[PDB]
Scaffold this active site. Structure first.
Site, short mmCIF file in Angstrom:
data_model
loop_
_atom_site.label_atom_id
_atom_site.label_comp_id
_atom_site.label_asym_id
_atom_site.label_seq_id
_atom_site.Cartn_x
_atom_site.Cartn_y
_atom_site.Cartn_z
N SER B 79 50.83 16.50 26.05
CA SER B 79 51.94 16.14 25.16
C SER B 79 52.78 14.97 25.69
O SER B 79 52.29 13.85 25.79
CB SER B 79 52.82 17.36 24.93
OG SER B 79 53.77 17.11 23.90
N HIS B 234 46.85 23.18 20.01
CA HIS B 234 47.57 22.20 20.81
C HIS B 234 47.40 22.42 22.32
O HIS B 234 47.31 21.46 23.09
CB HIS B 234 49.06 22.26 20.47
CG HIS B 234 49.91 21.35 21.30
ND1 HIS B 234 49.80 19.98 21.26
CD2 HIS B 234 50.89 21.62 22.20
CE1 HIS B 234 50.67 19.44 22.09
NE2 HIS B 234 51.34 20.41 22.68
#
Lengths: 256, 256
Positions: B79, B234
């Site tokens: 991220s 994710h």
């Protein structure tokens, strides 16, 4: 029945040790609070700011203080967590439906607060690669420690997976047994701590809180109920999570 | 071949997010370092003490500084970790064999440092129950945030187990994107960050770093290699750990 369980980790650990048990208890319909004690887990304080096991117990005492009148909880402590339970019970016994000891120290009221800790150090004197240091707080020299990775791997997370053991290496922090401070602390009371229902859970496969020690504790201060979990290791909340949840459900159905 | 991987978590997270991938990489024979960035994981600092993404990156910069001459590492960022990589690369490019972006932001050198972050906020504007606050540091107003539990459950840990999600609820801390600070920061350089090999890993099943955003990043700044992992969510280091390890092994065999 449903209960509100308050899970209490041991020194050098944090609420994260309960990451498997907490959701399972919630899946049974219970309310669960997993606290980070002082200078533990993601608590902002460092151990050098803490001068006693009572100060270390602040988050638990503060949590109990916040409970509205009439609301009771079932405390569950692992290893040294039993001391936090005794401390909390001498201040909020009326809010404790029962206390569950999970391969935990079981303080009594006839001997000083450090009694079972002194015995533990006799039965398990070699903490392997664990390191020690000293700091001063409130005029007393406190012995801090950082659990050794080998000790963690071989004696605590014996049968845990490498993914669980990794969390320990990443998250364990410096802490203290506050042994010398406990030795001079007023005894736990019969009216407070002595009055609460005590359930003792353990496994004879625990590689740190050895059978000799746990059986000695059971004989020293008779629990109201004893549950022996077959197999697993010291961290039953990770290796026998389902079993522990089942036991806690029975406790919730027995004490309120 | 064996490599030394340096795993870099995202804001509000800590080294603990790599608890599954780290041991798997070690099982392949690699050396792994999973750092806690400033005010993250069990780092002693609080976010209010941090005034920029560069200060936030201190643990990574300090780690790279400690590497003896000749020793190179492969950085792996998740991220927002991509920003820590860019910052580190402009100071220690010679010590970076390659950088792997794991569903991560991919800064460039033609636009200001906040460029991809501004785009991310356009593609994913609603952070649900995430809360915000402000603090001042070095004369600048910084926007802090605490990831909402619903956002964590639905968009980040979408297909993760309840035991993994629990760790997030227990361990995530307040952090910041330092967006306005990045906007005024000198651009990442072509000679430093621009020169390192960049491997982009992602899944189109990511519920926060959406396909539109990741495909936009790939077109904006062409990676040296792109790996698309089918399925998962994710947090591929939790849902596709084996797959990620296999990819990292190939990277270790390709770049040194």
């Amino acid at each position: 029945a449903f209960a509100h369980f308050v899970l209490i980790h041991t020194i050098c650990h944090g609420a994260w040790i309960w990451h498997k048990l907490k959701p399972l208890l919630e899946a049974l319909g219970h309310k669960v609070t997993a606290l980070d004690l002082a200078a533990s887990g993601v608590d902002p304080r460092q151990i050098e700011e803490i001068g006693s096991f009572d100060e270390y117990s602040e988050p638990l005492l503060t949590f109990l203080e916040a409970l509205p009148p009439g609301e009771k909880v079932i405390l569950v402590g692992e290893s040294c967590g039993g001391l936090n339970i005794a401390i909390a019970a001498d201040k909020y016994c009326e809010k404790i439906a029962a206390a569950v000891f999970h391969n935990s120290v079981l303080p009594d009221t006839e001997h000083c607060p450090s009694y079972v800790v002194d015995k533990l150090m006799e039965v398990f004197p070699d903490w392997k690669d664990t390191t020690y240091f000293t700091y001063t707080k409130d005029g007393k020299e406190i012995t801090g420690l950082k659990l050794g990775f080998t000790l963690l791997r071989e004696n605590l997370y014996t049968l845990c997976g490498p993914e669980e053991y990794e969390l320990a290496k990443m998250l364990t922090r410096k802490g203290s047994l506050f042994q010398n401070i406990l030795a001079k602390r007023p005894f736990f009371t019969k009216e407070g701590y002595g009055s609460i229902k005590k359930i003792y859970v353990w496994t004879d496969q625990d590689e740190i809180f050895l059978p000799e020690f746990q059986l000695w504790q059971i004989e020293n201060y008779k629990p109201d109920k004893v549950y022996k979990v077959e197999g697993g290791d010291h961290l039953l909340q990770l290796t026998k999570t389902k079993e522990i949840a089942e036991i806690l459900q029975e406790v919730a159905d027995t004490y309120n």
